Write a protein that binds this ligand. Structure first.
Ligand SMILES: CCCCCCCCCCCCCCCCCC(=O)OC[C@H](COP(=O)([O-])OCC(O)COP(=O)([O-])OC[C@@H](COC(=O)CCCCCCCCCCCCCCCCC)OC(=O)CCCCCCCCCCCCCCCCC)OC(=O)CCCCCCCCCCCCCCCCC
Ligand code: BCL
Ligand code: BCL
Ligand code: BCL
Ligand code: BCL
Ligand SMILES: CC[C@H]1c2cc3[nH]c4c(c3C)C(=O)[C@H](C(=O)OC)c4c3nc(cc4[nH]c(cc(n2)[C@@H]1C)c(C(C)=O)c4C)[C@@H](C)[C@@H]3CCC(=O)OC/C=C(\C)CCC[C@H](C)CCC[C@H](C)CCCC(C)C
Ligand SMILES: CC[C@H]1c2cc3[nH]c4c(c3C)C(=O)[C@H](C(=O)OC)c4c3nc(cc4[nH]c(cc(n2)[C@@H]1C)c(C(C)=O)c4C)[C@@H](C)[C@@H]3CCC(=O)OC/C=C(\C)CCC[C@H](C)CCC[C@H](C)CCCC(C)C
Ligand SMILES: COC1=C(OC)C(=O)C(C/C=C(\C)CC/C=C(\C)CC/C=C(\C)CC/C=C(\C)CC/C=C(\C)CC/C=C(\C)CC/C=C(\C)CC/C=C(\C)CC/C=C(\C)CCC=C(C)C)=C(C)C1=O
Ligand SMILES: COC(C)(C)C/C=C/C(C)=C/C=C/C(C)=C/C=C/C(C)=C\C=C\C=C(C)\C=C\C=C(/C)CC/C=C(\C)CCC=C(C)C
Ligand SMILES: [Fe+3]
Lengths: 236, 281, 302
């Protein structure tokens, strides 16, 4: 009968769909490797999918996945066991080197652009029309670290133009230079900004940006990675 | 056994218990102390369901079913052959769920991310405990809990619901269905949006989040935003389950009559409680 | 306490955004609406503009007519008594024509005619809106994903009040317009077909409904878990993978030994949701036409 036919046909379909879904999710990170960087023996039941290409806007070129997977950077880590499956220890300074929770990716060293081709993120002092419309304005507040010591003061807010969002807080340090702090990692209070992931002595170590009126995807990743990493390594 | 970009993340640290005794992986799985605990509870619990299969006299997955103690046992312990096995398994079930949650917290501390995931999971655990623990204790017997069986647990849903007429009238049930119905709509949209922008018409350049916001404004006059839609999704979900737990914590305790009758408070409001004509006059 | 990012700590506002242009007929866009500080704590504060145009106005008009038509009937029944109308708002109901009338448009108003009228409007209201979500994507040059997903919802809707009633032979098998009213219809439908829990498509639909809640709970929590590395900027993370996509994928791989990609998870998402009404529509279409009692059917598959 139809009912019995329809329900079997459905399971066949569902089997094909899960096959399509799983392979689509293999466009990044594959093939699997051994802890030494070499291709693993067992790659699993599903095969890599036929490559697809994205045409990036604003003349940024194209992208094709799956494709050549390379960290394009040195990983300061070493084995702690003679067998597979154990922790890899930081050979130097985890914060400085950028491994573990403080890891970053080698994203393009260009800024994200909006629909018209203009930098997506900009400090407010350079964003025409933008202002703080609700909540406590942080500009001018002193910044405290997880060690309860003051590390600086906020001098500006970096905002997302097309999505009208505060993404970064620009902070001035004791030596007169600035740094960026992820909006999502700070706690704005009545008379101060609290940064629990970093202690006063680690703010200078935050990676800096080259241009003073724009951040690149690569710089954002280094900045964010570094600050999140403080949650584990800054405990001391 | 590793994703191309995985090694840099596999560092020591983040564990809540045992220091580094269980700080290692098995294939793609992270272990941890709680990794071992959930294995303990799960095997034990599985074994017990197998011993329940023998006593019942069947190996058919569609027939096997572990029942809770009969009401005559109240909240006390009962013989394995009749409710004991169910009580023990529920402890193992509970032990495996919580352990899984805490294992997530550890994976969380190692990766340096937020705790949103284990937090969201805890709401499902709360729903489970409401049906096999909180409600039963408030009613006075393990007998009100649900059985563990593919079809026998559906019967329970059907018989429990009908014990109060049409369960559709449970007011917290109505709210809860709204969040479930809405969460799905929101998921279909979010998914379709992100995909129509990343996979535009053949030959065209990859659209931007601006096109995503423009598309929705043109359509319904408002866009919640890339960050807003993820906050919304988390919320609709946890809300659907929070009200589910609620519609049931109040059924059999503070209200035990027909749910449809509960609606008379509204119609009996003095002002119109007697005016003629209509449906209730 | 560390910031969780459910509500913004600070709102920032700039000039109203008139959105992208592409091939959109700018002559059809209204003007920016006001800015909502209330909404801005959770997401975008900008209301409007909106794009109307032919199809847009046809639906909105057709839609209100379906709405008013019903409301006329509610008042009739409430005897034009405002207090009554309110007391029994959830109880009123516009029922379809009786079995006798079959599938003709001859039944009298007070016997099913108004229903047929109200339906006709809702039928125009919905289909024109569908064309609207297709056209609005075309103008901007985006994929038609939203339109196709929405079709799946129309499917179940179409099956409940149009396709099944026809195949059955009378507008009688359709659903009534009323709050409590359509709840009873639903409960009934189940009883008359020997318990829907025995319908396999019903149980599948539920799996996907529960699955949709699990997934969005999973997906949303994750993006907020890695929003500290710019994770919500999903489109650019697809074109140029960052730590957000890596930690997001590794969290789940370490948890359940398998994972998704920034683009992939959205394919899981659109399908988990879409299948709810896809599987549902089928289960309902076969009820009463091919299978009379699902219990009996579950005994002998045929
Ligand atoms: C009876 C039920 C009928 C009821 C009607 C309800 C229909 C609801 C449809 C819902 C579809 C949602 C799909 C989401 C999606 O991808 O949308 C975009 C997708 C592309 O949109 P686009 O804007 O044109 O392209 C943008 C980019 O160029 C390209 O963008 P892209 O890359 O994102 O899109 C490519 C996309 C292309 O999408 C498709 O090709 C859509 C496929 C439609 C399936 C319809 C399901 C029917 C239900 C069958 C169940 C059986 C029970 C009976 O790839 C897929 O998603 C592939 C789908 C996987 C199919 C797996 C099939 C397995 C078969 C068994 C194999 C053997 C098993 C081995 C063991 O939409 C379509 O291609 C059109 C779908 C409309 C067909 C309607 C059916 C006619 C009536
Ligand atoms: C799937 C099987 C059944 C069915 C079973 C159920 C069940 C079971 C329940 C509902 C419920 C609802 N159903 Mg139904 N429903 C069916 C088909 C439909 C169709 C249709 C075109 O086929 C429609 C429009 C609806 C619509 C609705 C909503 C009125 C209500 C859910 C809220 C929600 O989240 O909506 C999703 C939509 C949005 C988020 C957008 C629009 C929001 C609307 C306008 C809000 C209306 C609020 C209402 C007027 C409250 C006033 C309160 C005052 C104090 C008086 N159903 C089919 C036939 N429906 C729930 C309920 O509470 O009912 C009373 C409920 O428990
Ligand atoms: C005929 C019977 C009644 C009825 C009786 C009931 C009853 C009785 C109950 C519900 C409940 C619910 N009903 Mg009802 N319901 C009816 C009709 C409807 C209709 C409709 C359109 O007609 C709808 C949409 C709903 C919708 C709903 C949901 C809102 C809600 C269940 C979701 C939930 O709580 O999840 C919560 C999630 C969980 C419980 C799962 C938790 C998962 C756990 C923690 C992990 C498990 C892991 C697993 C073992 C691991 C496997 C590992 C392997 C390696 C794979 N009902 C009819 C009228 N309904 C339930 C509720 O509110 O419950 C609180 C409930 O008890
Ligand atoms: C929420 C209110 C009721 C209830 C009402 C219903 C109703 C109504 C229906 C189901 C259905 C299902 N329910 Mg239930 N169910 C309840 C509580 C539970 C609990 C629990 C630990 O409390 C579990 C594990 C389940 C599990 C299940 C699935 C077997 C099946 C749904 C598939 C699905 O996609 O689910 C969502 C989850 C996913 C998509 C994730 C994948 C996980 C899979 C499904 C887990 C399978 C576990 C396996 C059966 C247990 C193995 C144990 C061994 C020891 C390893 N239910 C409560 C008591 N359930 C449906 C069905 O078709 O039943 C025959 C159905 O129609
Ligand atoms: C006592 C009654 C029976 C029962 C009878 C039925 C019946 C009968 C049906 C379902 C259906 C469903 N049931 Mg049930 N169900 C029962 C118990 C349960 C339980 C439980 C835990 O006990 C659960 C989880 C469910 C779950 C479900 C869903 C999976 C499914 C509906 C999907 C959906 O999203 O519809 C909601 C989505 C729609 C209706 C889509 C259409 C929407 C249209 C296009 C939009 C119109 C918009 C309007 C014009 C706009 C207004 C907007 C303005 C801005 C205001 N049922 C009991 C046992 N169930 C449905 C199904 O598909 O079954 C196979 C169905 O017909
Ligand atoms: C906001 C609540 C929503 C939600 C969220 C949610 N679920 C989650 C998470 C989150 C955030 C996870 O992180 C976790 C996960 O890792 O997912 C991949 C999970 C998860 N949600 C799951 C299931 C699930 N979630 C459901 C629902 C929901 N999950 C809600 C809609 C449902 C429904 C609707 O029924 C189910 C079945 C699991 C697949 C997974 C957690 C897996 C886990 O904890 O595994 C270790 C535990 C075992 C191996 C336990 C075995 C225990 C016993 C020995 C045997 C079984 C006893 C049980 C009582 C039998 C029941 C039989 C039935 C037939 C009645
Ligand atoms: C997988 C299937 C799921 C799904 C998907 C889905 N729904 C969708 C889409 C998708 C993919 C859309 O693209 C479409 C949409 O555009 O959403 C924003 C939509 C949509 N899903 C909707 C509803 C809906 N979806 C539901 C369900 C589901 N949708 C499933 C869970 C349900 C349930 C649970 O029953 C409902 C009620 C609509 C809101 C919307 C399509 C809008 C439409 O068809 O409109 C016709 C227009 C009218 C009826 C206009 C009049 C409305 C009222 C009578 C008046 C009040 C409001 C008005 C704005 C007031 C004006 C006042 C003046 C003074 C200004
Ligand atoms: C964009 O970002 C995102 C990602 O990627 C960057 C993601 O990937 C994901 C999530 C990933 C997906 C791939 C979605 C897939 C779809 C689903 C519907 C998933 C849920 C359903 C399942 C059936 C998952 C299966 C679950 C489990 C738990 C299998 C477990 C298997 C075992 C053998 C158990 C192991 C046993 C124990 C005891 C653990 C400890 C082990 C020891 C050895 C000790 C999300 C949400 C996301 O938003
Ligand atoms: C305050 O007073 C005013 C005047 C402002 C208005 C008040 C209005 C009110 C209070 C309205 C209340 C209405 C409500 C609560 C409506 C609820 C509807 C519900 C809950 C469910 C709807 C179910 C309907 C579905 C299943 C309908 C599907 C219909 C179709 C698939 C179309 C059917 C098509 C037909 C009959 C043929 C049309 C002709 C063609 C083109 C083939
Ligand atoms: Fe997303």
């Amino acid at each position: 009968d139809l009912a019995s036919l329809a329900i079997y046909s459905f399971w066949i379909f569902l089997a094909g769909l899960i096959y399509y879904l799983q392979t689509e999710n293999m466009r990044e990170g594959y093939p699997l490797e051994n802890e030494d960087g070499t291709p693993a023996a067992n790659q699993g039941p599903f095969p890599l999918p036929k490559p697809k290409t994205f045409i990036l806007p604003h003349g940024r070129g194209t992208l094709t996945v799956p494709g050549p997977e390379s960290e394009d950077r040195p990983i300061a880590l070493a084995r702690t066991a003679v067998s597979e499956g154990f922790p890899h220890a930081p050979t130097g300074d985890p914060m400085k080197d950028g491994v573990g929770p403080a890891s970053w990716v080698a994203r393009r060293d260009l800024p994200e652009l909006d629909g018209h081709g203009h930098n997506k993120i900009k400090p407010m002092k350079a964003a025409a029309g933008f202002h703080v419309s609700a909540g406590k304005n942080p500009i001018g507040l002193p910044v405290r670290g997880c060690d309860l010591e003051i590390a600086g003061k906020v001098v500006d807010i970096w905002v997302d133009i097309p999505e009208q969002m505060a993404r970064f807080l620009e902070v001035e340090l004791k030596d007169g230079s600035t740094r960026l702090l992820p909006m999502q990692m700070v706690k704005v209070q009545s008379n101060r900004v609290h940064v629990n992931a970093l202690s006063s002595d680690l703010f200078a170590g935050i990676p800096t940006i080259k241009s003073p009126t724009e951040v690149t995807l690569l710089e954002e990743d280094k900045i964010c990675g570094y600050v999140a990493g403080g949650l584990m390594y800054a405990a001391p | 056994a590793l994703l191309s970009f995985e090694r840099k993340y596999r560092v020591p640290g983040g564990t809540l218990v045992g220091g580094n005794l269980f700080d290692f992986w098995v294939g793609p799985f992270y272990v941890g102390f709680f990794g071992v605990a959930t294995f303990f509870f799960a095997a034990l619990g599985i074994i017990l369901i197998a011993w329940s299969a023998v006593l019942q006299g069947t190996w058919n997955p569609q027939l096997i079913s572990v029942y809770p103690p009969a009401l005559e046992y109240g909240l006390g312990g009962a013989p394995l052959a009749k409710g004991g096995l169910w009580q023990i398994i529920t402890i193992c079930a509970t032990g495996a769920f919580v352990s899984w949650a805490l294992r997530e917290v550890e994976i969380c501390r190692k990766l340096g991310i937020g705790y949103h995931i284990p937090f969201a999971f805890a709401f499902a655990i709360l729903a489970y405990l409401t049906l096999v623990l909180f409600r039963p204790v408030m009613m006075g017997a393990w007998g009100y809990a649900f059985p563990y069986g593919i079809w026998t647990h559906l019967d329970w849903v059907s018989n429990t619901g009908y014990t109060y007429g049409n369960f559709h009238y449970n007011p917290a049930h109505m709210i809860a269905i709204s969040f479930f119905f809405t969460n799905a709509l929101a998921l279909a949209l979010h998914g379709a949006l992100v995909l129509s922008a990343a996979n535009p018409e053949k030959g065209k350049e990859m659209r931007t989040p601006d096109h995503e916001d423009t598309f929705f404004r043109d359509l319904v006059g408002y866009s919640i935003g890339t960050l807003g839609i993820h906050r919304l999704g988390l919320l609709l979900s946890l809300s659907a389950v929070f009200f589910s737990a609620l519609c049931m914590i109040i059924t059999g305790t503070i209200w035990f009559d027909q749910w449809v009758d509960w609606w008379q408070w509204w119609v009996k409001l003095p002002w119109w409680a007697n005016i003629p004509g209509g449906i209730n006059g | 306490a560390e910031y969780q990012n459910i509500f913004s700590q600070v709102q920032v506002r700039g000039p109203a955004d008139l959105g992208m242009l592409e091939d959109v007929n700018l002559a059809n866009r209204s003007g920016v609406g006001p800015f909502s500080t209330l909404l801005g704590w959770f997401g975008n504060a900008q209301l409007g503009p909106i794009y109307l145009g032919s199809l847009g106005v046809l639906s909105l008009f057709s839609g209100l007519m379906w709405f008013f038509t019903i409301g006329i009937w509610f008042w009739y029944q409430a005897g034009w008594n405002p207090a009554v109308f309110l007391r029994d708002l959830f109880f009123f109901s516009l029922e379809p024509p009786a079995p006798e009338y079959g599938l003709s448009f001859a039944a009298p108003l007070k016997e099913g005619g108004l229903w047929l009228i109200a339906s006709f409007f809702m039928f125009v209201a919905v289909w024109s809106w569908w064309g609207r979500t297709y056209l609005r994507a075309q103008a901007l040059g985006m994929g038609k994903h939203t339109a196709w997903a929405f079709l799946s919802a129309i499917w179940l809707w179409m099956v409940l009040g149009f396709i099944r009633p026809i195949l059955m032979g009378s507008w009688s098998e359709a659903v009534p317009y009323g709050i409590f009213s359509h709840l009873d219809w639903t409960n009934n439908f189940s009883l008359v077909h020997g318990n829907l829990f025995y319908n396999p498509f019903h149980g599948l639909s539920i799996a996907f409904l529960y699955g949709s809640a699990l997934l969005f709970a999973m997906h949303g929590a994750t993006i907020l878990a890695v929003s500290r590395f710019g994770g919500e900027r999903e489109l650019e993370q697809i074109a140029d993978r960052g730590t957000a996509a890596e930690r997001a994928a590794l969290f789940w791989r370490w948890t359940m030994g398998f994972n998704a990609t920034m683009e992939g998870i959205h394919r899981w998402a659109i399908w988990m949701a879409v299948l709810v009404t896809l599987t549902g529509g089928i289960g309902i279409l076969l009820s009463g036409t091919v299978v009379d009692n699902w219990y009996v059917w579950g005994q002998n598959h045929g």
